[PDB]
Design an enzyme around this catalytic site. Structure first.
Site, PDB file in Angstrom:
ATOM      1  N   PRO A 142     -28.082   1.186  -9.347  1.00  0.00           N
ATOM      2  CA  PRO A 142     -29.561   1.515  -9.135  1.00  0.00           C
ATOM      3  C   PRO A 142     -30.210   1.588  -8.694  1.00  0.00           C
ATOM      4  CG  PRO A 142     -28.915   2.918 -11.147  1.00  0.00           C
ATOM      5  CD  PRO A 142     -27.659   1.553 -10.743  1.00  0.00           C
ATOM      6  N   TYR A 162       0.438  -1.271  -0.038  1.00  0.00           N
ATOM      7  CA  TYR A 162      -0.283   0.366   0.115  1.00  0.00           C
ATOM      8  C   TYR A 162       1.093   1.001   0.581  1.00  0.00           C
ATOM      9  CZ  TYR A 162      -4.338  -3.145   1.138  1.00  0.00           C
ATOM     10  OH  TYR A 162      -5.157  -3.919   0.496  1.00  0.00           O
ATOM     11  N   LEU A 221     -19.676  -2.180   0.243  1.00  0.00           N
ATOM     12  CA  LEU A 221     -20.692  -0.443  -0.659  1.00  0.00           C
ATOM     13  C   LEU A 221     -20.070  -0.890  -1.913  1.00  0.00           C
ATOM     14  CD1 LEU A 221     -21.431   2.709   0.796  1.00  0.00           C
ATOM     15  CD2 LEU A 221     -22.600   0.350   0.314  1.00  0.00           C
TER      16      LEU A 221
HETATM   17  N1  LIG Z   1      -7.246  -8.259  -0.212  1.00  0.00           N
HETATM   18  C1  LIG Z   1      -7.366  -7.695  -0.854  1.00  0.00           C
HETATM   19  O1  LIG Z   1      -7.386  -8.667  -1.922  1.00  0.00           O
HETATM   20  C2  LIG Z   1      -7.819  -6.357  -0.566  1.00  0.00           C
HETATM   21  C3  LIG Z   1      -8.303  -5.149  -1.971  1.00  0.00           C
HETATM   22  C4  LIG Z   1      -9.367  -4.803  -1.407  1.00  0.00           C
HETATM   23  C5  LIG Z   1      -8.991  -3.717  -0.329  1.00  0.00           C
HETATM   24  N2  LIG Z   1      -8.969  -4.828   1.256  1.00  0.00           N
HETATM   25  C6  LIG Z   1      -8.772  -4.634   2.349  1.00  0.00           C
HETATM   26  O2  LIG Z   1     -11.063  -4.095   2.836  1.00  0.00           O
HETATM   27  C7  LIG Z   1     -10.623  -2.791   3.579  1.00  0.00           C
HETATM   28  C8  LIG Z   1     -11.909  -2.630   2.946  1.00  0.00           C
HETATM   29  O3  LIG Z   1     -11.721  -1.571   1.475  1.00  0.00           O
HETATM   30  P1  LIG Z   1     -12.734  -2.152   0.531  1.00  0.00           P
HETATM   31  O4  LIG Z   1     -12.534  -1.956  -0.652  1.00  0.00           O
HETATM   32  O5  LIG Z   1     -13.973  -3.195   0.391  1.00  0.00           O
HETATM   33  O6  LIG Z   1     -13.470  -0.477   0.361  1.00  0.00           O
HETATM   34  P2  LIG Z   1     -13.599   0.216   1.729  1.00  0.00           P
HETATM   35  O7  LIG Z   1     -12.215   0.527   2.515  1.00  0.00           O
HETATM   36  O8  LIG Z   1     -14.816   0.057   2.429  1.00  0.00           O
HETATM   37  O9  LIG Z   1     -14.441   1.472   0.563  1.00  0.00           O
HETATM   38  C9  LIG Z   1     -13.463   3.099   0.789  1.00  0.00           C
HETATM   39  C10 LIG Z   1     -14.376   4.622   0.204  1.00  0.00           C
HETATM   40  O10 LIG Z   1     -15.097   4.112   1.244  1.00  0.00           O
HETATM   41  C11 LIG Z   1     -15.410   5.413   1.945  1.00  0.00           C
HETATM   42  N3  LIG Z   1     -16.143   5.701   3.499  1.00  0.00           N
HETATM   43  C12 LIG Z   1     -15.375   4.849   3.765  1.00  0.00           C
HETATM   44  N4  LIG Z   1     -16.653   4.977   6.056  1.00  0.00           N
HETATM   45  C13 LIG Z   1     -17.440   6.088   4.780  1.00  0.00           C
HETATM   46  C14 LIG Z   1     -18.511   5.951   5.859  1.00  0.00           C
HETATM   47  N5  LIG Z   1     -18.466   6.101   6.891  1.00  0.00           N
HETATM   48  N6  LIG Z   1     -19.334   6.466   4.387  1.00  0.00           N
HETATM   49  C15 LIG Z   1     -19.047   7.675   3.770  1.00  0.00           C
HETATM   50  N7  LIG Z   1     -17.718   6.526   2.669  1.00  0.00           N
HETATM   51  C16 LIG Z   1     -17.064   6.095   3.830  1.00  0.00           C
HETATM   52  C17 LIG Z   1     -14.172   5.815   1.804  1.00  0.00           C
HETATM   53  O11 LIG Z   1     -13.968   7.863   1.639  1.00  0.00           O
HETATM   54  P3  LIG Z   1     -13.301   8.060   3.131  1.00  0.00           P
HETATM   55  O12 LIG Z   1     -11.885   7.870   2.650  1.00  0.00           O
HETATM   56  O13 LIG Z   1     -13.869   9.693   2.541  1.00  0.00           O
HETATM   57  O14 LIG Z   1     -14.260   8.155   4.406  1.00  0.00           O
HETATM   58  C18 LIG Z   1     -13.291   5.620   0.653  1.00  0.00           C
HETATM   59  O15 LIG Z   1     -13.119   5.738  -0.250  1.00  0.00           O
HETATM   60  C19 LIG Z   1      -9.507  -2.052   2.876  1.00  0.00           C
HETATM   61  O16 LIG Z   1      -8.719  -1.230   3.969  1.00  0.00           O
HETATM   62  C20 LIG Z   1      -7.926  -3.579   2.565  1.00  0.00           C
HETATM   63  O17 LIG Z   1      -7.330  -3.346   3.936  1.00  0.00           O
HETATM   64  C21 LIG Z   1      -8.617  -5.802   0.473  1.00  0.00           C
END
Ligand SMILES: NC(=O)c1ccc[n+]([C@@H]2O[C@H](COP(=O)([O-])OP(=O)(O)OC[C@H]3O[C@@H](n4cnc5c(N)ncnc54)[C@H](OP(=O)(O)O)[C@@H]3O)[C@@H](O)[C@H]2O)c1
Ligand SMILES: [Mg+2]
Length: 282
Positions: free
Chosen positions: A214, A56, A209
């Site tokens: 939509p 990262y 999310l």
């Molecule tokens: N192992 C893998 O293949 C891999 C791949 C993807 C993700 N991951 C892991 O999983 C975790 C989750 O990532 P994800 O891809 O599932 O997506 P996510 O982290 O859940 O979504 C990130 C986005 O959501 C927004 N967000 C978070 N809380 C919010 C809220 N309460 N209201 C409105 N927006 C909100 C953030 O904006 P703001 O920052 O402005 O709040 C950011 O732009 C990551 O941190 C990572 O460690 C792993």
């Protein structure tokens, strides 16, 4: 509530560290200070599970976690993942030769300032798509296995894997968690989640999310409104009640969202609401 991940109990509302970096998880974050504040508040709010990676922003996300939280509570579990490297064009590329996996494990050790890693996710990539695809993972796992014997790694987990791959993996070493794409609208892994649960292996969804149509999005919005919650809160709460082995790692670079995500634990989903939410995928 809680789950025993490996030998340490973790609050099922954890923290994904992927937003503490520049755009495309590359380069430094918008504001390093706010990143530090977010990590410290998360602990203060009861988080004791952090998900991260040394690819990262290359390295910087781990260094921020160190600057912010070292020396770590011994209640804290840091989970990290290996198997990819970053192009200097922000690209993500396969990095699973023994030399690369060994270097990745040590990079984590140094940047986090640790002597052993709690949990290391092996992150699979097969085919030209992105998600789960069939193919043997024995070679990578064997390498992680050996670093476990050397004491550099306590526990091994899997990321982006099909049920067969998990099955092949679990004959080479113990797997403590599976981390896959899964949310209200993408429930292909439903069966595996329950099977993992019966074996006491945790499941870690990402994109809480992500990729809603939509109609899917407006339904979730409708449900939130009626509950006085946000869509993110509803999405997390649905995951929490779906199965007791599910661990959440929502990422955020904003303190307000952090507190809001953590408030999702107070949200209680009625049967009629679950009926509406289960129909989002159907
Ligand atoms: N192992 C893998 O293949 C891999 C791949 C993807 C993700 N991951 C892991 O999983 C975790 C989750 O990532 P994800 O891809 O599932 O997506 P996510 O982290 O859940 O979504 C990130 C986005 O959501 C927004 N967000 C978070 N809380 C919010 C809220 N309460 N209201 C409105 N927006 C909100 C953030 O904006 P703001 O920052 O402005 O709040 C950011 O732009 C990551 O941190 C990572 O460690 C792993
Ligand atoms: Mg994230």
């Amino acid at each position: 509530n809680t789950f025993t991940l490996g030998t340490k109990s973790v609050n099922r509302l954890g923290y994904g560290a992927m937003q503490l970096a520049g755009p495309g998880v590359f380069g430094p974050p918008r504001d390093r200070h706010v990143a530090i504040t977010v990590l410290r508040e998360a602990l203060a709010l009861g988080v004791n599970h952090i998900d991260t990676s040394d690819f990262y922003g290359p390295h910087v996300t781990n260094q921020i976690i160190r600057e912010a939280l070292y020396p770590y509570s011994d209640d804290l579990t840091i989970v990290t993942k290996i198997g990819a490297r970053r192009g200097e064009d922000a690209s993500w590329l396969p990095a699973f030769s023994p030399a690369e996996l060994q270097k990745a494990v040590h990079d984590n050790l140094r940047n986090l300032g640790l002597d052993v890693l709690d949990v290391v996710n092996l992150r699979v990539m097969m085919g030209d798509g992105h998600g789960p695809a069939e193919g043997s993972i024995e070679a990578s796992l064997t390498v992680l296995a050996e670093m476990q014997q050397q004491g550099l790694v306590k526990h091994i987990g899997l990321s982006n894997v099909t049920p067969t791959q998990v099955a092949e993996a679990r004959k080479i070493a113990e797997i403590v968690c599976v981390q896959n794409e899964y949310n209200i609208a993408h429930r292909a892994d439903d069966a595996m989640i329950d099977a993992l649960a019966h074996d006491g292996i945790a499941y870690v969804p990402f994109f809480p999310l992500g990729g809603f149509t939509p109609l899917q999005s407006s339904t979730l919005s409708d449900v939130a409104a009626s509950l006085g919650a946000t869509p993110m809160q509803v999405a997390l709460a649905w995951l929490l009640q779906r199965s007791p082995n599910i661990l959440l790692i929502p990422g955020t670079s904003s303190v307000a969202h952090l507190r809001e995500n953590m408030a999702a634990e107070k949200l209680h989903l009625s049967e009629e609401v679950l009926s509406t939410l289960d129909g989002i995928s159907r």
